[PDB]
Design a protein around this ligand. Structure first.
Ligand SMILES: [Zn+2]
Lengths: 95, 189, 346
Protein backbone atom coordinates (compact mmCIF):
# COMPACT_ATOMS: atom_id res chain seq x y z
CA UNK A 1 0.00 0.00 0.00
CA UNK A 2 3.19 2.17 0.02
CA UNK A 3 2.67 3.74 3.41
CA UNK A 4 5.60 5.34 5.15
CA UNK A 5 7.06 4.24 8.46
CA UNK A 6 5.66 7.37 10.09
CA UNK A 7 2.09 7.19 8.79
CA UNK A 8 1.76 3.57 9.81
CA UNK A 9 2.49 4.78 13.32
CA UNK A 10 -0.39 7.25 13.00
CA UNK A 11 -2.84 4.59 11.84
CA UNK A 12 -1.69 2.08 14.46
CA UNK A 13 -1.84 4.42 17.44
CA UNK A 14 -5.29 5.76 16.67
CA UNK A 15 -6.78 2.36 15.81
CA UNK A 16 -5.47 0.99 19.11
CA UNK A 17 -6.70 4.10 20.93
CA UNK A 18 -10.20 4.05 19.46
CA UNK A 19 -11.11 0.38 19.60
CA UNK A 20 -9.06 -0.40 22.70
CA UNK A 21 -7.59 -3.71 21.57
CA UNK A 22 -4.66 -3.47 19.21
CA UNK A 23 -5.07 -4.82 15.70
CA UNK A 24 -1.88 -3.65 13.98
CA UNK A 25 1.40 -4.58 15.58
CA UNK A 26 3.95 -1.90 16.54
CA UNK A 27 6.87 -1.05 14.30
CA UNK A 28 9.51 -3.06 16.14
CA UNK A 29 7.70 -6.39 15.85
CA UNK A 30 7.20 -5.59 12.20
CA UNK A 31 10.90 -5.12 11.52
CA UNK A 32 11.65 -8.22 13.58
CA UNK A 33 9.34 -10.07 11.22
CA UNK A 34 11.03 -8.40 8.27
CA UNK A 35 14.37 -10.14 8.77
CA UNK A 36 12.91 -13.57 7.99
CA UNK A 37 12.08 -12.61 4.42
CA UNK A 38 15.27 -10.88 3.30
CA UNK A 39 18.40 -12.71 2.20
CA UNK A 40 20.86 -13.49 4.93
CA UNK A 41 18.85 -15.40 7.49
CA UNK A 42 18.95 -19.12 6.84
CA UNK A 43 21.65 -21.79 7.03
CA UNK A 44 22.53 -23.52 3.78
CA UNK A 45 25.49 -25.29 2.25
CA UNK A 46 26.92 -26.08 -1.16
CA UNK A 47 28.33 -29.41 -2.30
CA UNK A 48 31.14 -29.06 -3.52
CA UNK A 49 31.84 -25.66 -1.93
CA UNK A 50 31.89 -22.70 -4.26
CA UNK A 51 35.20 -21.50 -5.65
CA UNK A 52 36.01 -17.80 -5.05
CA UNK A 53 32.74 -17.31 -3.09
CA UNK A 54 32.66 -16.75 0.67
CA UNK A 55 31.24 -19.53 2.82
CA UNK A 56 29.33 -17.40 5.33
CA UNK A 57 25.55 -17.51 5.45
CA UNK A 58 24.58 -14.16 6.95
CA UNK A 59 25.35 -11.29 4.58
CA UNK A 60 22.51 -9.18 3.28
CA UNK A 61 23.09 -5.92 1.43
CA UNK A 62 26.70 -5.42 0.34
CA UNK A 63 28.24 -2.53 -1.54
CA UNK A 64 27.83 -3.24 -5.22
CA UNK A 65 31.14 -1.70 -6.27
CA UNK A 66 32.87 -4.73 -4.69
CA UNK A 67 35.67 -2.77 -3.06
CA UNK A 68 36.56 -0.90 -6.25
CA UNK A 69 39.07 1.58 -4.93
CA UNK A 70 38.19 5.27 -5.25
CA UNK A 71 41.41 7.21 -4.83
CA UNK A 72 42.36 10.26 -6.86
CA UNK A 73 45.28 8.39 -8.40
CA UNK A 74 43.04 5.81 -10.06
CA UNK A 75 40.16 5.80 -12.53
CA UNK A 76 37.38 8.09 -11.23
CA UNK A 77 34.01 6.68 -10.21
CA UNK A 78 30.88 8.35 -8.89
CA UNK A 79 28.19 5.67 -9.20
CA UNK A 80 26.32 4.04 -6.33
CA UNK A 81 25.39 0.38 -6.43
CA UNK A 82 23.87 -2.15 -4.07
CA UNK A 83 23.35 -5.89 -4.39
CA UNK A 84 22.82 -9.11 -2.51
CA UNK A 85 25.01 -12.10 -3.13
CA UNK A 86 23.61 -14.40 -5.76
CA UNK A 87 23.43 -17.60 -3.69
CA UNK A 88 21.93 -16.01 -0.59
CA UNK A 89 19.28 -14.44 -2.80
CA UNK A 90 18.30 -17.79 -4.28
CA UNK A 91 18.14 -19.38 -0.82
CA UNK A 92 15.57 -16.91 0.51
CA UNK A 93 13.77 -16.87 -2.83
CA UNK A 94 13.32 -20.60 -2.52
CA UNK A 95 12.24 -20.57 1.09
CA UNK B 1 26.38 2.51 -22.25
CA UNK B 2 29.02 3.30 -19.62
CA UNK B 3 30.75 0.04 -20.43
CA UNK B 4 33.56 0.12 -17.87
CA UNK B 5 31.27 0.89 -14.94
CA UNK B 6 28.74 -1.70 -16.12
CA UNK B 7 31.40 -4.40 -16.28
CA UNK B 8 32.80 -3.27 -12.91
CA UNK B 9 29.45 -3.86 -11.24
CA UNK B 10 28.20 -6.90 -13.18
CA UNK B 11 31.44 -8.83 -12.95
CA UNK B 12 31.04 -10.39 -9.44
CA UNK B 13 27.50 -11.53 -10.22
CA UNK B 14 28.73 -13.38 -13.29
CA UNK B 15 31.52 -14.81 -11.13
CA UNK B 16 28.95 -16.17 -8.67
CA UNK B 17 26.71 -17.41 -11.47
CA UNK B 18 29.55 -19.29 -13.13
CA UNK B 19 30.45 -20.72 -9.74
CA UNK B 20 27.03 -22.18 -9.00
CA UNK B 21 26.60 -24.17 -12.21
CA UNK B 22 28.40 -27.28 -10.96
CA UNK B 23 27.18 -27.57 -7.37
CA UNK B 24 24.26 -28.74 -5.24
CA UNK B 25 22.60 -26.58 -2.62
CA UNK B 26 21.47 -28.63 0.36
CA UNK B 27 18.91 -26.84 2.47
CA UNK B 28 16.01 -27.90 4.67
CA UNK B 29 12.52 -27.68 3.17
CA UNK B 30 10.05 -28.47 5.92
CA UNK B 31 12.03 -30.75 8.19
CA UNK B 32 14.26 -32.96 6.05
CA UNK B 33 16.99 -31.39 3.88
CA UNK B 34 16.52 -31.24 0.12
CA UNK B 35 18.98 -30.69 -2.73
CA UNK B 36 18.70 -28.07 -5.45
CA UNK B 37 20.49 -27.73 -8.79
CA UNK B 38 20.05 -24.70 -10.98
CA UNK B 39 19.68 -23.98 -14.67
CA UNK B 40 20.20 -20.37 -15.72
CA UNK B 41 18.76 -18.86 -18.89
CA UNK B 42 19.57 -15.23 -19.55
CA UNK B 43 16.84 -14.04 -21.85
CA UNK B 44 15.18 -10.83 -20.73
CA UNK B 45 17.44 -8.40 -22.60
CA UNK B 46 16.31 -5.88 -25.18
CA UNK B 47 18.09 -5.66 -28.51
CA UNK B 48 20.57 -2.93 -27.57
CA UNK B 49 21.68 -4.57 -24.31
CA UNK B 50 21.89 -8.00 -25.88
CA UNK B 51 23.88 -6.46 -28.72
CA UNK B 52 26.34 -4.68 -26.46
CA UNK B 53 27.26 -7.19 -23.77
CA UNK B 54 27.38 -10.09 -26.19
CA UNK B 55 29.92 -8.08 -28.18
CA UNK B 56 28.42 -7.24 -31.55
CA UNK B 57 28.33 -4.17 -33.73
CA UNK B 58 25.48 -1.80 -32.91
CA UNK B 59 21.89 -2.09 -34.16
CA UNK B 60 22.40 -0.05 -37.30
CA UNK B 61 24.88 -2.58 -38.64
CA UNK B 62 25.07 -4.39 -41.92
CA UNK B 63 24.71 -7.53 -39.76
CA UNK B 64 21.21 -7.67 -38.30
CA UNK B 65 20.45 -10.95 -36.53
CA UNK B 66 21.66 -11.70 -33.04
CA UNK B 67 20.79 -15.35 -33.72
CA UNK B 68 22.27 -16.00 -37.17
CA UNK B 69 24.93 -14.53 -39.46
CA UNK B 70 23.36 -12.96 -42.55
CA UNK B 71 23.52 -9.39 -43.79
CA UNK B 72 20.43 -7.32 -44.43
CA UNK B 73 21.12 -7.50 -48.12
CA UNK B 74 20.86 -11.28 -47.79
CA UNK B 75 17.62 -11.17 -45.80
CA UNK B 76 15.52 -9.50 -48.50
CA UNK B 77 16.18 -12.26 -51.06
CA UNK B 78 15.91 -15.42 -48.96
CA UNK B 79 13.24 -14.26 -46.53
CA UNK B 80 12.51 -17.45 -44.59
CA UNK B 81 15.04 -20.28 -44.66
CA UNK B 82 17.54 -19.34 -41.96
CA UNK B 83 18.80 -21.19 -38.86
CA UNK B 84 20.16 -20.23 -35.43
CA UNK B 85 23.92 -20.33 -35.16
CA UNK B 86 25.12 -17.59 -32.78
CA UNK B 87 26.04 -19.18 -29.46
CA UNK B 88 28.16 -17.51 -26.77
CA UNK B 89 31.39 -19.54 -26.96
CA UNK B 90 31.37 -19.13 -30.74
CA UNK B 91 31.32 -15.37 -30.25
CA UNK B 92 34.13 -15.62 -27.71
CA UNK B 93 36.38 -17.54 -30.10
CA UNK B 94 35.46 -15.14 -32.89
CA UNK B 95 36.66 -12.25 -30.75
CA UNK B 96 39.86 -14.22 -30.17
CA UNK B 97 40.19 -14.54 -33.96
CA UNK B 98 39.69 -10.77 -34.35
CA UNK B 99 42.31 -9.97 -31.74
CA UNK B 100 44.92 -12.43 -32.97
CA UNK B 101 44.46 -11.78 -36.73
CA UNK B 102 46.06 -15.12 -37.62
CA UNK B 103 45.28 -15.19 -41.35
CA UNK B 104 47.01 -11.84 -42.08
CA UNK B 105 44.27 -9.93 -43.88
CA UNK B 106 42.87 -6.42 -43.66
CA UNK B 107 39.95 -5.11 -41.65
CA UNK B 108 37.37 -5.22 -44.46
CA UNK B 109 37.54 -9.00 -44.74
CA UNK B 110 38.51 -9.74 -41.14
CA UNK B 111 35.24 -8.14 -40.06
CA UNK B 112 33.44 -10.31 -42.60
CA UNK B 113 35.29 -13.35 -41.29
CA UNK B 114 34.34 -12.77 -37.65
CA UNK B 115 30.82 -11.59 -38.62
CA UNK B 116 30.99 -8.23 -36.95
CA UNK B 117 32.20 -9.35 -33.53
CA UNK B 118 34.53 -6.62 -32.31
CA UNK B 119 34.54 -6.81 -28.51
CA UNK B 120 34.98 -9.42 -25.81
CA UNK B 121 31.55 -10.76 -24.80
CA UNK B 122 31.28 -11.11 -21.06
CA UNK B 123 27.75 -12.32 -20.22
CA UNK B 124 26.53 -15.81 -21.12
CA UNK B 125 23.21 -15.11 -22.82
CA UNK B 126 20.94 -17.30 -24.91
CA UNK B 127 19.79 -15.99 -28.28
CA UNK B 128 16.09 -15.16 -28.37
CA UNK B 129 13.70 -12.48 -29.50
CA UNK B 130 11.71 -10.24 -27.20
CA UNK B 131 7.94 -9.95 -27.18
CA UNK B 132 7.28 -6.34 -26.15
CA UNK B 133 9.65 -4.32 -28.33
CA UNK B 134 8.93 -6.62 -31.28
CA UNK B 135 5.24 -5.73 -31.17
CA UNK B 136 5.91 -2.00 -30.75
CA UNK B 137 8.36 -2.09 -33.66
CA UNK B 138 5.90 -3.81 -36.01
CA UNK B 139 3.26 -1.28 -34.92
CA UNK B 140 5.41 1.72 -35.80
CA UNK B 141 6.55 0.08 -39.02
CA UNK B 142 3.19 -0.37 -40.62
CA UNK B 143 2.02 2.95 -39.18
CA UNK B 144 4.82 4.35 -41.33
CA UNK B 145 3.57 2.23 -44.23
CA UNK B 146 0.10 3.75 -43.71
CA UNK B 147 1.61 7.23 -43.94
CA UNK B 148 3.45 6.04 -47.05
CA UNK B 149 0.37 4.57 -48.73
CA UNK B 150 -1.63 7.79 -48.27
CA UNK B 151 0.78 9.62 -50.50
CA UNK B 152 0.63 7.02 -53.34
CA UNK B 153 4.32 6.32 -53.84
CA UNK B 154 3.63 3.24 -55.98
CA UNK B 155 2.45 5.49 -58.81
CA UNK B 156 5.29 8.01 -58.64
CA UNK B 157 8.22 7.84 -56.19
CA UNK B 158 10.36 10.27 -54.16
CA UNK B 159 8.24 13.21 -53.25
CA UNK B 160 10.27 15.56 -51.08
CA UNK B 161 10.07 16.05 -47.33
CA UNK B 162 7.19 18.54 -47.50
CA UNK B 163 4.53 16.16 -48.79
CA UNK B 164 5.31 13.83 -45.90
CA UNK B 165 4.39 16.15 -43.03
CA UNK B 166 1.06 16.72 -44.78
CA UNK B 167 0.67 12.94 -45.09
CA UNK B 168 1.33 12.54 -41.36
CA UNK B 169 -1.16 15.31 -40.56
CA UNK B 170 -3.93 13.85 -42.72
CA UNK B 171 -3.26 10.38 -41.24
CA UNK B 172 -3.44 11.24 -37.56
CA UNK B 173 -6.21 13.80 -38.12
CA UNK B 174 -8.31 11.14 -39.87
CA UNK B 175 -7.56 8.45 -37.29
CA UNK B 176 -8.29 10.82 -34.40
CA UNK B 177 -11.52 11.69 -36.21
CA UNK B 178 -12.61 8.05 -36.52
CA UNK B 179 -11.07 6.06 -33.66
CA UNK B 180 -10.39 8.94 -31.21
CA UNK B 181 -6.72 7.93 -31.09
CA UNK B 182 -4.64 10.87 -29.87
CA UNK B 183 -1.43 11.45 -31.86
CA UNK B 184 1.45 10.21 -29.70
CA UNK B 185 5.15 10.61 -30.48
CA UNK B 186 6.65 7.81 -28.35
CA UNK B 187 4.62 4.76 -29.34
CA UNK B 188 3.60 2.50 -26.44
CA UNK B 189 2.12 -0.97 -26.42
CA UNK C 1 55.55 27.88 -18.66
CA UNK C 2 53.10 28.55 -21.50
CA UNK C 3 49.49 27.55 -20.83
CA UNK C 4 46.77 27.50 -23.46
CA UNK C 5 43.14 26.44 -23.72
CA UNK C 6 42.23 24.00 -26.48
CA UNK C 7 38.99 23.58 -28.40
CA UNK C 8 37.94 20.06 -29.29
CA UNK C 9 36.29 18.25 -32.19
CA UNK C 10 32.94 16.48 -32.22
CA UNK C 11 34.07 13.11 -30.82
CA UNK C 12 35.41 14.66 -27.62
CA UNK C 13 33.94 11.79 -25.56
CA UNK C 14 36.66 9.31 -26.60
CA UNK C 15 39.07 10.70 -24.01
CA UNK C 16 39.12 8.86 -20.67
CA UNK C 17 41.73 9.18 -17.91
CA UNK C 18 44.76 7.12 -18.81
CA UNK C 19 45.34 7.49 -22.52
CA UNK C 20 48.74 7.20 -24.16
CA UNK C 21 50.29 9.54 -26.71
CA UNK C 22 52.52 7.66 -29.14
CA UNK C 23 54.87 10.14 -30.81
CA UNK C 24 56.17 9.15 -34.24
CA UNK C 25 58.38 11.65 -36.12
CA UNK C 26 56.59 14.67 -34.71
CA UNK C 27 53.18 13.18 -35.47
CA UNK C 28 51.08 12.51 -32.38
CA UNK C 29 48.79 9.55 -31.82
CA UNK C 30 46.12 8.73 -29.28
CA UNK C 31 45.57 5.33 -27.71
CA UNK C 32 43.11 4.08 -25.13
CA UNK C 33 39.68 5.33 -26.17
CA UNK C 34 36.51 4.85 -24.12
CA UNK C 35 34.48 1.76 -24.86
CA UNK C 36 35.29 -0.99 -27.32
CA UNK C 37 36.29 0.19 -30.82
CA UNK C 38 33.34 1.44 -32.84
CA UNK C 39 32.74 1.38 -36.55
CA UNK C 40 33.78 4.99 -37.10
CA UNK C 41 37.37 3.80 -36.47
CA UNK C 42 37.67 0.02 -36.21
CA UNK C 43 41.21 -0.08 -34.84
CA UNK C 44 40.96 2.08 -31.75
CA UNK C 45 44.07 4.16 -32.34
CA UNK C 46 43.78 7.77 -33.43
CA UNK C 47 45.72 10.27 -35.45
CA UNK C 48 45.76 13.26 -33.11
CA UNK C 49 46.70 16.61 -34.64
CA UNK C 50 46.11 20.10 -33.29
CA UNK C 51 46.01 23.25 -35.43
CA UNK C 52 45.17 26.70 -34.00
CA UNK C 53 44.24 25.09 -30.65
CA UNK C 54 41.62 22.96 -32.43
CA UNK C 55 42.34 19.23 -32.49
CA UNK C 56 41.05 16.59 -34.87
CA UNK C 57 40.84 12.94 -33.92
CA UNK C 58 41.12 11.21 -37.25
CA UNK C 59 41.23 7.44 -37.70
CA UNK C 60 44.31 5.39 -38.44
CA UNK C 61 44.67 2.05 -40.19
CA UNK C 62 46.81 -1.00 -39.57
CA UNK C 63 48.97 -3.28 -41.67
CA UNK C 64 48.07 -6.62 -43.21
CA UNK C 65 49.58 -8.70 -40.39
CA UNK C 66 49.04 -6.45 -37.35
CA UNK C 67 47.38 -7.63 -34.14
CA UNK C 68 44.21 -5.66 -33.46
CA UNK C 69 44.56 -4.72 -29.88
CA UNK C 70 42.20 -3.82 -27.03
CA UNK C 71 42.19 -0.23 -25.76
CA UNK C 72 44.26 -0.43 -22.60
CA UNK C 73 43.44 2.11 -19.93
CA UNK C 74 46.61 2.24 -17.83
CA UNK C 75 49.51 0.41 -19.49
CA UNK C 76 53.22 0.97 -19.23
CA UNK C 77 54.81 2.39 -22.37
CA UNK C 78 58.39 2.94 -23.46
CA UNK C 79 60.19 4.27 -26.52
CA UNK C 80 62.47 1.55 -27.85
CA UNK C 81 64.66 3.50 -30.28
CA UNK C 82 66.32 0.50 -31.92
CA UNK C 83 63.82 1.50 -36.30
CA UNK C 84 61.76 3.51 -33.84
CA UNK C 85 59.05 1.58 -32.01
CA UNK C 86 56.89 1.68 -28.89
CA UNK C 87 56.36 -1.04 -26.30
CA UNK C 88 53.03 -1.44 -24.48
CA UNK C 89 52.67 -3.73 -21.47
CA UNK C 90 49.86 -4.53 -19.10
CA UNK C 91 46.94 -2.17 -18.74
CA UNK C 92 43.26 -2.65 -18.11
CA UNK C 93 40.87 -3.63 -20.96
CA UNK C 94 37.31 -2.21 -20.65
CA UNK C 95 35.89 -5.40 -19.16
CA UNK C 96 38.07 -4.52 -16.12
CA UNK C 97 40.37 -7.46 -16.79
CA UNK C 98 44.14 -7.04 -16.81
CA UNK C 99 46.39 -8.03 -19.67
CA UNK C 100 49.84 -9.58 -19.68
CA UNK C 101 50.89 -9.17 -23.32
CA UNK C 102 53.64 -7.16 -24.97
CA UNK C 103 52.45 -5.02 -27.88
CA UNK C 104 55.18 -3.76 -30.22
CA UNK C 105 54.02 -0.84 -32.34
CA UNK C 106 55.93 0.58 -35.31
CA UNK C 107 55.14 2.32 -38.61
CA UNK C 108 54.75 0.18 -41.71
CA UNK C 109 54.28 2.98 -44.26
CA UNK C 110 53.34 6.67 -44.36
CA UNK C 111 52.04 7.96 -47.70
CA UNK C 112 50.25 11.30 -48.36
CA UNK C 113 50.73 12.11 -44.64
CA UNK C 114 48.41 9.14 -43.91
CA UNK C 115 50.07 6.66 -41.56
CA UNK C 116 49.72 2.90 -41.37
CA UNK C 117 50.85 1.31 -38.13
CA UNK C 118 51.73 -2.26 -37.39
CA UNK C 119 51.70 -3.93 -34.00
CA UNK C 120 52.84 -7.40 -33.10
CA UNK C 121 52.19 -9.50 -30.01
CA UNK C 122 55.23 -10.64 -28.08
CA UNK C 123 54.54 -13.05 -25.23
CA UNK C 124 57.30 -13.56 -22.69
CA UNK C 125 58.68 -16.98 -21.79
CA UNK C 126 60.46 -17.58 -18.52
CA UNK C 127 59.83 -15.64 -15.31
CA UNK C 128 56.79 -13.77 -16.63
CA UNK C 129 55.50 -10.93 -14.41
CA UNK C 130 51.97 -11.12 -13.11
CA UNK C 131 49.42 -8.92 -14.92
CA UNK C 132 49.21 -5.45 -13.47
CA UNK C 133 48.65 -1.80 -14.29
CA UNK C 134 50.29 1.44 -13.27
CA UNK C 135 53.80 0.01 -13.46
CA UNK C 136 56.77 1.29 -15.46
CA UNK C 137 59.03 -0.07 -18.19
CA UNK C 138 62.23 1.44 -19.59
CA UNK C 139 64.70 0.26 -22.22
CA UNK C 140 68.34 0.64 -21.23
CA UNK C 141 71.56 0.00 -23.16
CA UNK C 142 74.91 -1.45 -22.11
CA UNK C 143 77.89 -2.86 -24.03
CA UNK C 144 76.13 -3.08 -27.38
CA UNK C 145 72.98 -4.70 -25.98
CA UNK C 146 69.63 -3.56 -24.64
CA UNK C 147 67.28 -4.78 -21.93
CA UNK C 148 63.89 -3.64 -20.72
CA UNK C 149 63.76 -2.92 -17.02
CA UNK C 150 60.33 -3.20 -15.41
CA UNK C 151 59.30 -1.98 -11.97
CA UNK C 152 55.99 -3.22 -10.70
CA UNK C 153 52.66 -1.60 -10.01
CA UNK C 154 49.35 -2.60 -8.46
CA UNK C 155 47.15 -5.50 -9.45
CA UNK C 156 44.36 -7.81 -8.38
CA UNK C 157 44.55 -10.44 -5.68
CA UNK C 158 45.65 -13.86 -6.99
CA UNK C 159 43.00 -16.28 -8.26
CA UNK C 160 42.67 -18.17 -4.92
CA UNK C 161 42.10 -15.25 -2.54
CA UNK C 162 39.49 -13.41 -4.62
CA UNK C 163 36.19 -13.30 -2.76
CA UNK C 164 33.16 -11.86 -4.51
CA UNK C 165 32.38 -9.35 -1.82
CA UNK C 166 35.78 -7.76 -2.42
CA UNK C 167 36.23 -8.87 -6.01
CA UNK C 168 37.55 -5.52 -7.23
CA UNK C 169 40.19 -4.80 -4.59
CA UNK C 170 43.79 -4.15 -5.56
CA UNK C 171 47.14 -4.62 -3.85
CA UNK C 172 50.65 -3.64 -4.84
CA UNK C 173 52.71 -6.33 -6.49
CA UNK C 174 55.91 -7.58 -4.90
CA UNK C 175 58.70 -5.03 -5.36
CA UNK C 176 61.12 -7.02 -7.46
CA UNK C 177 62.70 -5.73 -10.66
CA UNK C 178 62.05 -7.58 -13.90
CA UNK C 179 64.52 -7.66 -16.78
CA UNK C 180 63.13 -8.41 -20.24
CA UNK C 181 64.80 -9.41 -23.50
CA UNK C 182 62.69 -8.46 -26.51
CA UNK C 183 64.56 -10.31 -29.25
CA UNK C 184 63.97 -13.69 -27.62
CA UNK C 185 61.14 -12.90 -25.19
CA UNK C 186 62.99 -13.69 -21.98
CA UNK C 187 62.31 -12.52 -18.45
CA UNK C 188 64.32 -12.58 -15.24
CA UNK C 189 63.30 -11.46 -11.79
CA UNK C 190 65.69 -9.75 -9.42
CA UNK C 191 65.15 -9.48 -5.69
CA UNK C 192 67.22 -6.86 -3.95
CA UNK C 193 67.00 -5.80 -0.31
CA UNK C 194 67.13 -2.04 -0.77
CA UNK C 195 63.62 -1.99 -2.26
CA UNK C 196 61.17 -2.88 0.50
CA UNK C 197 57.68 -1.45 -0.04
CA UNK C 198 55.35 -1.65 -3.00
CA UNK C 199 55.20 1.37 -5.28
CA UNK C 200 52.72 2.51 -7.92
CA UNK C 201 52.19 5.47 -10.26
CA UNK C 202 55.83 6.52 -9.92
CA UNK C 203 58.04 8.27 -12.50
CA UNK C 204 60.86 6.47 -14.30
CA UNK C 205 63.75 8.14 -16.17
CA UNK C 206 66.27 6.18 -18.25
CA UNK C 207 69.74 7.71 -18.76
CA UNK C 208 71.71 5.35 -21.01
CA UNK C 209 72.96 2.93 -18.33
CA UNK C 210 70.77 3.63 -15.31
CA UNK C 211 67.13 4.21 -14.41
CA UNK C 212 65.95 6.66 -11.77
CA UNK C 213 62.70 5.93 -9.94
CA UNK C 214 61.15 9.00 -8.39
CA UNK C 215 57.99 9.46 -6.35
CA UNK C 216 55.04 7.12 -6.32
CA UNK C 217 52.24 5.93 -4.08
CA UNK C 218 52.53 3.04 -1.62
CA UNK C 219 49.30 1.28 -0.73
CA UNK C 220 50.74 -0.67 2.21
CA UNK C 221 50.55 2.39 4.48
CA UNK C 222 48.63 4.78 2.15
CA UNK C 223 51.60 7.14 2.10
CA UNK C 224 53.46 8.89 -0.72
CA UNK C 225 57.18 8.46 -0.03
CA UNK C 226 59.72 11.09 -1.00
CA UNK C 227 62.77 8.85 -1.46
CA UNK C 228 64.04 8.34 -4.99
CA UNK C 229 66.11 5.37 -6.10
CA UNK C 230 68.89 4.93 -8.62
CA UNK C 231 69.24 1.59 -10.39
CA UNK C 232 72.43 0.69 -12.23
CA UNK C 233 72.30 -2.26 -14.61
CA UNK C 234 75.04 -3.93 -16.58
CA UNK C 235 74.71 -6.99 -18.73
CA UNK C 236 78.07 -8.63 -19.45
CA UNK C 237 78.61 -11.59 -21.73
CA UNK C 238 77.58 -13.54 -18.62
CA UNK C 239 74.56 -12.95 -16.41
CA UNK C 240 73.39 -9.35 -15.94
CA UNK C 241 73.92 -7.56 -12.65
CA UNK C 242 71.65 -5.00 -11.02
CA UNK C 243 72.39 -2.57 -8.19
CA UNK C 244 70.22 -0.11 -6.29
CA UNK C 245 71.06 3.00 -4.29
CA UNK C 246 69.01 5.45 -2.23
CA UNK C 247 69.99 9.01 -3.09
CA UNK C 248 68.90 12.06 -1.07
CA UNK C 249 66.74 15.00 -2.10
CA UNK C 250 63.69 13.42 -3.70
CA UNK C 251 60.08 14.52 -3.83
CA UNK C 252 56.67 13.01 -3.02
CA UNK C 253 54.49 12.76 -6.11
CA UNK C 254 52.20 10.16 -7.66
CA UNK C 255 50.83 9.92 -11.21
CA UNK C 256 53.06 12.78 -12.31
CA UNK C 257 53.93 13.55 -15.92
CA UNK C 258 57.54 14.00 -16.98
CA UNK C 259 58.93 15.01 -20.35
CA UNK C 260 62.16 15.99 -22.07
CA UNK C 261 62.50 19.75 -22.48
CA UNK C 262 66.18 19.82 -23.57
CA UNK C 263 68.96 17.35 -24.14
CA UNK C 264 69.58 15.49 -20.85
CA UNK C 265 67.29 17.70 -18.77
CA UNK C 266 63.74 16.70 -17.86
CA UNK C 267 60.77 18.51 -16.37
CA UNK C 268 57.97 17.07 -14.25
CA UNK C 269 54.50 18.56 -13.80
CA UNK C 270 51.57 18.09 -11.42
CA UNK C 271 50.68 14.69 -10.04
CA UNK C 272 49.35 14.62 -6.48
CA UNK C 273 50.92 15.72 -3.20
CA UNK C 274 48.37 14.40 -0.70
CA UNK C 275 45.11 12.54 -1.27
CA UNK C 276 43.27 15.86 -1.41
CA UNK C 277 46.19 18.15 -2.31
CA UNK C 278 47.01 18.49 -5.99
CA UNK C 279 50.58 19.49 -6.87
CA UNK C 280 50.67 22.90 -8.56
CA UNK C 281 54.47 23.24 -8.50
CA UNK C 282 56.73 21.83 -11.19
CA UNK C 283 60.23 20.45 -10.84
CA UNK C 284 63.14 20.46 -13.27
CA UNK C 285 65.62 17.60 -12.99
CA UNK C 286 69.08 17.94 -14.50
CA UNK C 287 70.76 14.73 -15.58
CA UNK C 288 74.43 13.89 -15.98
CA UNK C 289 76.86 11.09 -16.62
CA UNK C 290 76.52 9.94 -13.01
CA UNK C 291 74.89 12.73 -10.98
CA UNK C 292 71.48 14.41 -11.13
CA UNK C 293 69.81 17.29 -9.32
CA UNK C 294 66.16 18.16 -8.64
CA UNK C 295 65.28 21.85 -8.39
CA UNK C 296 62.01 23.76 -8.47
CA UNK C 297 61.09 25.99 -11.40
CA UNK C 298 58.88 29.07 -11.54
CA UNK C 299 55.44 27.47 -10.75
CA UNK C 300 53.44 28.63 -13.80
CA UNK C 301 50.08 30.33 -14.16
CA UNK C 302 46.92 28.31 -13.61
CA UNK C 303 43.39 29.24 -14.69
CA UNK C 304 40.36 29.27 -12.38
CA UNK C 305 39.47 25.67 -13.23
CA UNK C 306 42.91 24.12 -12.82
CA UNK C 307 43.28 25.97 -9.54
CA UNK C 308 39.71 25.06 -8.56
CA UNK C 309 39.15 21.50 -9.80
CA UNK C 310 39.65 18.26 -7.91
CA UNK C 311 41.49 15.93 -10.33
CA UNK C 312 43.48 16.16 -13.54
CA UNK C 313 45.11 13.79 -16.01
CA UNK C 314 47.29 13.97 -19.09
CA UNK C 315 50.58 13.01 -20.73
CA UNK C 316 53.27 14.47 -22.98
CA UNK C 317 53.09 14.96 -26.73
CA UNK C 318 56.80 14.60 -27.48
CA UNK C 319 58.24 18.03 -28.27
CA UNK C 320 58.05 19.11 -24.64
CA UNK C 321 54.28 19.46 -24.88
CA UNK C 322 52.06 18.41 -21.98
CA UNK C 323 48.43 17.59 -22.73
CA UNK C 324 46.12 17.99 -19.73
CA UNK C 325 42.46 17.51 -18.94
CA UNK C 326 39.93 18.72 -16.35
CA UNK C 327 36.51 17.28 -15.35
CA UNK C 328 34.53 20.50 -15.03
CA UNK C 329 31.34 21.26 -13.12
CA UNK C 330 28.16 19.27 -13.71
CA UNK C 331 25.87 21.65 -11.78
CA UNK C 332 26.33 24.43 -14.31
CA UNK C 333 24.74 25.75 -17.51
CA UNK C 334 25.29 22.25 -18.93
CA UNK C 335 29.05 22.48 -18.97
CA UNK C 336 31.00 20.01 -21.09
CA UNK C 337 32.27 16.57 -20.08
CA UNK C 338 35.93 17.61 -20.00
CA UNK C 339 38.00 20.71 -20.59
CA UNK C 340 41.41 20.42 -22.17
CA UNK C 341 44.65 22.35 -21.95
CA UNK C 342 48.12 22.42 -23.48
CA UNK C 343 51.29 23.33 -21.59
CA UNK C 344 54.51 24.29 -23.35
CA UNK C 345 58.01 24.67 -21.95
CA UNK C 346 60.03 24.87 -25.24
ZN1 LIG D 1 18.70 -14.66 -38.62
Amino acid sequence: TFLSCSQYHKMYRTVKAITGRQIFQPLHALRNAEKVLLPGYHPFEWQPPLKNVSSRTDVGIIDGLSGLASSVDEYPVDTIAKRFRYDSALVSALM
Amino acid sequence: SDHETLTAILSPLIAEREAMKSSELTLEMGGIPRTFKFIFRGTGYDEKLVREVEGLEASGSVYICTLCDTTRLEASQNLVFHSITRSHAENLQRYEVWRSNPYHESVEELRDRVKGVSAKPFIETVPSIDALHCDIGNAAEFYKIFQLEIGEVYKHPNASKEERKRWQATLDKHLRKRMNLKPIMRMNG
Amino acid sequence: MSLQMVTVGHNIALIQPGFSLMNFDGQVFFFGQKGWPKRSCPTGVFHFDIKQNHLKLKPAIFSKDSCYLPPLRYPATCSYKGKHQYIIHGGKTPNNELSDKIYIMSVACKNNKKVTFRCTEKDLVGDVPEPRYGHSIDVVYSRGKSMGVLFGGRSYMPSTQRTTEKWNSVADCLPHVFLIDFEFGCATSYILPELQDGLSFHVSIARNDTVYILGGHSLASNIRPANLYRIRVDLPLGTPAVNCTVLPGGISVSSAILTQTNNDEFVIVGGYQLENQKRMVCSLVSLGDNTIEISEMETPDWTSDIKHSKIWFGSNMGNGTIFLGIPGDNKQAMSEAFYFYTLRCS
